[PDB]
Structure formats: C-alpha cells, structure tokens
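Batch queue: ligand-bound targets. Current item pairs a single chain with zinc ion. No template structures supplied; prediction is de novo from sequence plus SMILES. Inputs echoed for audit trail.
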Amino acid sequence: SSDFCCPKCQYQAPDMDTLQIHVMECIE
Ligand SMILES: [Zn+2]
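Prediction returned. Tokens below.
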C-alpha cells in the first residue's frame, strides 16, 4: 500500500519523501 520502490535495491518506502531521501543515500 503506497509502495515507493528504490530502483537500486529491494526497498519500498511508504512515503515518497522517504524514497527521495533513500535514493540520495543509495548512491552505491
Ligand atoms: Zn536503495
């Protein structure tokens, strides 16, 4: 439910905000 997934690893964030933060952390 509201699964914002990181196109770099298996990570689905509940918030789109969280996704943005994660993606900019998920540089590796
Ligand atoms: Zn990621």
